[PDB]
Structures are given as structure tokens and as C-alpha cells.
Amino acid sequence: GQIQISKHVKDVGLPSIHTPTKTKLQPSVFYDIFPGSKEPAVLTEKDPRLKVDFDSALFSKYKGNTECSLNEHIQVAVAHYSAQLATLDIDPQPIAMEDSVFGMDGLEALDLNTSAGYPYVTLGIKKKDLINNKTKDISKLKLALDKYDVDLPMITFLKDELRKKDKIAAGKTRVIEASSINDTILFRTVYGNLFSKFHLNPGVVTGCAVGCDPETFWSKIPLMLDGDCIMAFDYTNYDGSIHPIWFKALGMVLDNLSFNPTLINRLCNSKHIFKSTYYEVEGGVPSGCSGTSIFNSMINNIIIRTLVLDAYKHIDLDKLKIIAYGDDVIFSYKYKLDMEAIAKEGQKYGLTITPADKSSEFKELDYGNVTFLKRGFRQDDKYKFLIHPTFPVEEIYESIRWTKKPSQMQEHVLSLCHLMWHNGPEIYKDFETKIRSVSAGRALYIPPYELLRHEWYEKF
């Protein structure tokens, strides 16, 4: 990520975007019932919990781009992965706008709650003002499309969420570049079929997990990654470390499929508006963007193949199975491979790869300690072939202590329970007890472990 130009919105003819300065998160009635350290992320330069300057650390993700071009290995990576995707027979033609908005098979309907982005956010216009899902009317949407066109700047929002104390004093708050609904629609009409195909085919052919249901997909992973092992690792600032060449490679893949190879460049050479500053970035991917999960996974698919070929000879790509969800990736090879060595091949590209789960060194992993989409793996008691997706109990305790909407505690709780029960009867029972220890939690409906277990078996 290299900031090319930065200037006042007034000197460019753009409005100043107003962003929430204070968190909506507040202590819930369970705050004292469960243990936790996390707290609301810093949303303003003036937060006593700070140590370093806000704007400083905030815009530190942009280290710039490392000098490097396309090599034969990347070309080979692109070639193999393309051939893999070619087996899915994806239709290159665009999709009707009616499908881009209300969805189709494999493509969820557009979220009508999130902001419409620029410039609607500055005109008081929301998505439900352009789309009438009630009568499926989108006439007003079409007008807006032709009125403001496309390739509009992205709005930078600070991510109001829970973070560890060290991220609080360090002012490390995550940003969420919000694309204009106009560009979300364009990207869906163009790539819609690809997005659809991927969502219906999470696995090793697409090398992607976007669209999967962890509850059933977890049982499949072990069968797909049928290798001599299983590897995972962490990325230090993945989004801001994606060098432009990966987009060039992504384009080639898309071109081998007969899709637009240039549109995606609007993500590489992106336009942004933080608050009163307008700027353009060269390199990196827009964090939290609308439809970038799939593109990020594809890039990772190209990266993994490259680093492997870079670190080893006599490698058989067909034997390297990959499953990615954006920057999160797990893969395997017929034979054992050194993760540390693979990691070092990333340095030349500007990718900082560290041990999985913020570990000390690059230690060997197994389905016993490996994680993916922040979930571990645990065999079911009754049926050993079914795999429980385990979510960190600590994270659940952390989440339940805060709430953004008090009158929605029932919904919040239910979500947690669906994650929780996968950790076991004893743990779930203790969770239920703590909740029901206060009148407010007693009035809540908590799904019994038997009911959750029963419903889970019927999903296979």
C-alpha cells in the first residue's frame, strides 16, 4: 500500500465525510458475570487510553510497495490455478441487474442495511431509498446509477468493535473502506457468475471457503486436504502488503476464464475519502470492502503456489491443496514441507508471514491445534467422522460483556450459543448457568444442548 496523492476534499471538489467519533458499544448486564479485557476500539484522536498519535498509527499500514515484478513461478501459479477453475465451467457473461440486487442461486441478495456509500451518505439517501425489496422496485436505483456513474471513491469508516488493551493504547483501530453501491452493483453484474460459482463450490477446486457453512464444511476439510500434513500461518497486515503484481496475476487468471481483467484494478489503484482528506492508494486491497473476499482468496491461491515453488524444487502443484477465505489460508502437500522456509519466500514480495496463531516459532501443526476462520477442530463424540467447528470460549465471554443494542440481547445471546455448544456439553452448561444467574438472562431463550446437537446432525 503506497499513498500516491493526498489532498483536501475542498481542493478536489469533494464533501467532507462525517464519521462516528464515539462507540455504540456499552457494558451489558453480563459484564461482571464473565471475565474479559477487551474494550471499544479507539475512534478519536482524543482518547485518554491512547499513547501514540492516532492519525500516525492509523495510516501506518501503508509501508509502500516492495520492488518486484512477475517471474516464471507466478506465471506457473496462475496457469495451474486457472486450469483448476476451468473445470467449473463458469459462464463469463454478466448477470441481469435484478439478480445483482435481489440475488440468484449462489449469490445472496444485497444487504439493505449497510450504507450506500458515496455520495448517498452525504445526501441522506440510504439503500432502502433506491431499492424497494417489498415491491422489488429498483427504478430509483437505475437513475442513481446513471446520475453518479461508477468508479466513485470509497468512504473510510473506523471499525467500532472490541479490541485488546494493547490495541487500544497503540491506537490500532481497523478501517473499513465502504464502496459505493454503484460500484458494488457493477462488480456484481460483471463477476456475478464467478462469485456464485465460488459460493456453491467451497473447496479445493476453487481453493476457497467463501460461501461455506463451517458446521458441515469442517467435516469435509480433512477429506479435501488429504496430504502428509496440514499447514496454516499468519499474515502481518495482509491487506496492505498486496503488491500490484498480484493483481496483474489475478487479472491473468480472470482473463483465462474470459472475465474482465481490468475492473479489479480499481481495487489496486483505489480512491478514498477519510474525513476531510481525499487520497489514492497504489497497491494493497481495500479492507472490509464489499465483494473482495473472493478476490483476496484467489490472490492467496496464487501466492501460496508461488511461495511453494520459490522455496522448493520438484514440486507437484496438483498435490498442493489449498483452501482460502481472504487472507486466512490452510493447505497441504503430499509430503511434509517447512512452513518457515515457505514464509521466507514472501519477504522478497513484501509479504510478512509469521507463525500461526501468533506463536513463537514455526512449529508443526495438526487438526488438533490448527485453526481456520478463527475456529479450531474437534471430533464429535458419537460420530468421529463429523467435525465440530470450535470457537474460542474466551472470545464468546468477551463478546457477551458488551452490547450495541440492549433490546437485542436475545439475538446476541442466540448467536453465541450456536458458536458455544460446539465446545462441549460441560462448557455449554456452565455458559447457560452464568447467563441464567441474573433475572435479565433468565428471561432469555437459550437453546438446549440436545436441541442444538439434534439440529446439527440433520444438516449432514
Chain residues binding ligand DMX by CB under 6 A are: 222, 366-368, 377, 379, 387
358: cell is 501468533
Q: Fill in the amino acid letter for 261.
A: P
Q: Among 325, 321, 315, which Cα is nearest to 375's?
A: 325
To which residue does cell 507463525 refer? Answer: 355
Show binding-site residues for Mg(2+). Answer: 234, 327
| CB of residue 223 to ligand DMX, shortest distance in Å | 8
Given the complex with ligand DMX, which of 125 and 224 has the nearer CB atom?
224
Select from 334, 325, 261 the least CA-distant residue to 299.
Answer: 325
Q: 102 or 367, CB closer to ligand DMX?
A: 367
Closer residue to ligand DMX in complex, CB, 63/375: 375
Residue showing the smallest CB distance to ligand DMX in the complex: 366
Instruction: Give, to the nearest 10 degrees, the angle between helix 72-86 and helix 244-256.
Output: 40
Query: Nearest Cα to 325, choosing from 239, 229, 202?
Result: 202
Nearer to ligand DMX, 166 or 381 (CB): 381
Given the complex with ligand DMX, which of 114 and 369 has the nearer CB atom?
369
For the record, the C-alpha cell of 9 comes out as: 476534499
- Beta carbon of residue 303, minimum distance to ligand DMX (angstroms, whole number): 24
**C-alpha–C-alpha distance, residues 421 and 139, integer Å:** 45
* Cβ–Cβ < 8 Å for 193, 105: no
Identify which of 53, 44, 27, 21 has the alpha carbon closest to the alpha carbon of residue 399. Answer: 27
DSSP letter string, 102-165: H-BTTBPPPPSSS---TTGGGTT--GGGT-BTTTTB-HHHHHHHHHH-S-PPEEEEE--SEE-H
The CB-of-460 to ligand DMX minimum distance in angstroms stands at 15
Which strands form 269-273's sheet, in the order they lie side by side?
2-8, 277-282, 269-273, 154-158, 175-178
CB of 201 vs ligand DMX, minimal distance in Å: 21
Distance CA 68, CA 66 (A): 6
Taking the complex as a whole, how short is the minimal distance between the CB of residue 450 and ligand DMX, in angstroms? 23
Instruction: Note whether 198 and 204 are within 8 A (CB).
Output: no
* Nearer of residues 134 and 384 to ligand DMX, judged by Cβ: 384
Q: Quick one: residue 241, left, alpha or beta (phi over 0 = left, psi -120 to 50 = alpha)?
A: alpha
Give the shortest CB-386-to-ligand DMX separation in angstroms.
Answer: 10
Instruction: Indicate the SS3 state at residue 337.
Output: coil
Output 233 or 377, the one with its CB closest to ligand DMX: 377
* Pair 115, 179: CB distance under 8 Å: no
- Minimum distance from residue 329 beta carbon to ligand DMX (Å): 17
Q: In which residue are the cell numbers 492508494 written?
A: 281
Residue 8 pairs with which residues in a beta bridge? 277
Choose between 61 and 378: whose C-beta lies nearer to ligand DMX.
378
Smallest distance from the beta carbon of 384 to ligand DMX, in angstroms? 8
Output 167 or 375, the one with its CB closest to ligand DMX: 375
Task: Name the DSSP letter for residue 15.
Answer: P
Nearest distance in Å: CB 217, ligand DMX:
13
CB 380 within 8 A of CB 386: yes
In whole angstroms, what is the distance from residue 34 CA to residue 27 CA? 12
